[PDB]
């Protein structure tokens, strides 16, 4: 038993809007917790679904969701959100390219 809850699922962390900054050609891994184990969710970037691929790794864990990135490109820079059946989180990301002497 041990039942008696009002909301289906509520986020535990973060608590409020966060801010993060990384450098191009680096690894970016976010973090998010939930109040429900084995619960579905969809990541959104800049208000647009994320294109899961080799450049985008999505790890899921009991009441724990995070977005990993092998190559944080200037494009990867934006706001992330772990949409779910209840609430959503906000993670600020900024990929700043390192000062390079006209190097390609």
Curated annotation (Swiss-Prot):
Component of the 3M complex, composed of core components CUL7, CCDC8 and OBSL1. Interacts with CCDC8. Interacts with CUL7; the interaction is direct. Interacts with FBXW8. Interacts (via N-terminal Ig-like domain) with TTN/titin (via C-terminal Ig-like domain); the interaction is direct. This is Obscurin-like protein 1. It comes from the Eukaryota. It is found in: Cytoplasm; Cytoplasm, Cytoskeleton, Microtubule organizing center, Centrosome; Cytoplasm, Perinuclear region; Golgi apparatus. Widely expressed, with predominant levels found in the heart. Core component of the 3M complex, a complex required to regulate microtubule dynamics and genome integrity. It is unclear how the 3M complex regulates microtubules, it could act by controlling the level of a microtubule stabilizer. Acts as a regulator of the Cul7-RING(FBXW8) ubiquitin-protein ligase, playing a critical role in the ubiquitin ligase pathway that regulates Golgi morphogenesis and dendrite patterning in brain. Required to localize CUL7 to the Golgi apparatus in neurons. Residues 8-94 form the Ig-like domain. It is linked to 3M syndrome 2: An autosomal recessive disorder characterized by severe pre- and postnatal growth retardation, facial dysmorphism, large head circumference, and normal intelligence and endocrine function. Skeletal changes include long slender tubular bones and tall vertebral bodies. Disulfide bonds join 32-82. It comes from Homo sapiens.
């Amino acid at each position: 038993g041990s039942s008696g809850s009002s909301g289906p699922v509520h986020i535990l962390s973060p608590q409020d809007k966060v801010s993060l900054t990384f450098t191009t050609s680096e690894r970016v891994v976010l973090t998010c917790e939930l109040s429900r184990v084995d619960f579905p969710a969809t990541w959104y970037k800049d208000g647009q679904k994320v294109e899961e691929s080799e450049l985008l790794v999505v790890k899921m864990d009991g009441r724990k969701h995070r977005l990993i990135l092998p190559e944080a490109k200037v494009q990867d820079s934006g706001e992330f959100e772990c949409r779910t059946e209840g609430v959503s989180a906000f993670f600020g990301v900024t990929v700043q390219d390192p000062s390079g002497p006209s190097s390609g």
